[PDB]
């Protein structure tokens, strides 16, 4: 009886995720508009056979947050399509011509794309993951392990 009904959850409020990572200064409408502006540029770049430039442009800004679920899903769908619309033979040059933070975003989002395979194509994500881990190293996956949960 009295063994159940735990009380430790209220007397000492445990640290909650916003206490660990910096809070998002941008507003929901601002980031939503920014993503809604970035995505069609990526789609158009895919249409004109310049998928590398489209991915580079889409990689410049990356949204996050617990209140931006829908726009994050649209961003992820666009990113998955852009990456799947890239020839495989040109990957190493792209990977080598990036900064560490950009590669971190790439690996983070491809790994999140791996989490939902009932709607995506896993083969291209796995191939990209293999090549980026081969070239950049394991530090990218380390950063993935130590990234924000909302990312």
């Amino acid at each position: 009886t009295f063994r159940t009904l735990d009380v430790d959850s209220i007397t000492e409020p445990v640290l909650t995720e916003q206490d660990i990572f910096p809070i998002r200064n941008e507003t929901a409408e601002q980031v939503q508009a920014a993503v809604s502006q970035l995505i069609p540029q990526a789609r158009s770049a895919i249409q004109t056979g310049n998928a590398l430039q489209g991915l580079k442009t889409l990689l410049s800004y990356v949204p996050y947050g617990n209140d931006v679920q829908e726009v994050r899903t649209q961003y992820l769908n666009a990113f998955v399509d852009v990456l799947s619309n890239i020839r495989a033979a040109d990957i190493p040059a792209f990977v080598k011509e990036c900064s560490t933070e950009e590669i971190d975003n790439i690996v983070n989002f491809i790994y999140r794309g791996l989490a939902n395979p009932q709607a995506y194509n896993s083969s291209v994500l796995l191939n990209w993951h293999e090549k980026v881990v081969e070239i950049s190293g394991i530090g990218c996956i380390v950063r993935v392990l130590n990234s924000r949960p909302d990312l």
Binding site: L15, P117, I138, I141, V142, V144, L145
Partner: protein, 168 residues
């Protein structure tokens, strides 16, 4: 086996070897005690984000890490319900002897069929550069076993049918 599972297998290998940077850490809520932090989940400031690796909708690799303990549960293919029953029974036998395995859980997490749990001590004493080797080796050999055992089922059914029918 391989020549077939290159990208999925290497992704699992890399993620596992990156997620095995464990450390000795006590309990932040109980004194003079240390527990696997991935299983309790009471202090979120030391729990790395859950990570999932997949190749197809029926194959997943949930990778949950922490400061000291790592839990790694996978799903293996079950194309037809014969393989479903075979996988369930085989993996039950596999987890029934977790005492001699040191990196197994007696009961997998829900929605899966097996869950490894590498606490710090295993990395402390057992050299861990082949724990992952055993992981991938098992992930392919298990499908090998399921196919072989369904072949053996067919063979024994044929043998018993012939034995019954020949004695008219």
């Amino acid at each position: 086996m391989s020549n077939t599972l290159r990208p999925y297998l290497n992704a699992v290998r890399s993620t596992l070897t990156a997620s095995l940077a464990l450390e000795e850490f006590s309990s932040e809520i109980v004194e003079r005690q240390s527990q696997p932090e991935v299983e309790v989940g009471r202090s979120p400031e030391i729990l790395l984000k859950p990570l999932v690796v997949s190749r197809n909708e029926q194959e997943q690799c949930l990778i949950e890490s922490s400061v000291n303990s790592v839990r790694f549960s996978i799903r293996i293919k079950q194309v037809d319900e014969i393989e479903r029953i075979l996988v369930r029974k085989f993996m039950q036998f596999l987890m029934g002897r977790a005492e001699s395995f040191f990196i197994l859980r007696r009961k997998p997490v829900q929605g899966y069929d097996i869950s490894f749990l590498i606490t710090n001590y295993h990395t402390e004493e057992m050299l861990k550069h082949k724990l992952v080797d055993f992981i991938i080796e098992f992930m392919e050999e298990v499908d090998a076993e399921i196919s072989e055992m369904k072949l053996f089922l067919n063979g024994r059914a044929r043998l018993v049918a012939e034995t019954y029918l020949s004695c008219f």
